[PDB]
Amino acid sequence: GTSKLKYVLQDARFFLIKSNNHENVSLAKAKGVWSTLPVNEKKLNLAFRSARSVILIFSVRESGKFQGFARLSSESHHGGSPIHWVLPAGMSAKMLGGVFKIDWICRRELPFTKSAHLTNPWNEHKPVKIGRDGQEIELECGTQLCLLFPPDESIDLYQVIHKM
Numbered sequence: 817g818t819s820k821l822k823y824v825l826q827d828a829r830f831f832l833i834k835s836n837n838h839e840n841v842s843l844a845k846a847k848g849v850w851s852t853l854p855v856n857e858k859k860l861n862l863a864f865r866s867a868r869s870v871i872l873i874f875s876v877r878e879s880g881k882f883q884g885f886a887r888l889s890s891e892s893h894h895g896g897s898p899i900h901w902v903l904p905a906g907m908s909a910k911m912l913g914g915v916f917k918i919d920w921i922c923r924r925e926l927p928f929t930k931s932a933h934l935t936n937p938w939n940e941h942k943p944v945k946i947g948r949d950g951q952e953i954e955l956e957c958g959t960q961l962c963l964l965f966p967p968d969e970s971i972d973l974y975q976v977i978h979k980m
């Protein structure tokens with residue numbers, strides 16, 4: 817069903833995450849972590865304190881799809897085992913130093929063709945697939961986007977709910 821999912825998404829905030837490569841999203845799915853550039857790191861830390869759920873919706877550049885979505889379980893922290901991110905040209909390891917812990921809600925993909933009816937008011941009403949890394953997605957659009965993903969039967973949102 818969709819009732820626990822809707823409960824998790826109630827009054828949530830949503831952010832588009834754009835990865836330049838598949839490798840880093842695969843690592844994030846395996847290890848439950850994400851890192852972003854300092855500008856977005858500060859925004860996500862502010863949002864984590866402001867809302868009961870902050871949802872990251874991932875899309876790999878040139879894939880034509882979203883690869884899933886996850887909820888922040890923590891603000892960024894430094895000083896763990898260095899995650900072996902594949903580094904885009906011009907991006908340093910220090911730039912990705914802040915590590916957020918995340919709980920995946922759906923690890924399944926959604927092609928952009930399925931979200932063509934959803935526009936984001938916080939990005940000039942452009943289709944929700946359009947946006948830079950860190951673009952906030954307004955509540956209604958983000959909720960409807962998350963509800964379009966195929967159900968991920970491998971995830972139990974009970975423990976996710978128990979973190980809110």
Ligand SMILES: CNc1ncnc2c1ncn2C1CC1
Nearest residue numbers: 834835836840851852901949
């Ligand atoms: C581990 N984090 C990341 N991996 C790959 N690309 C990323 C990224 N964060 C932002 N980007 C885009 C270049 C803007």
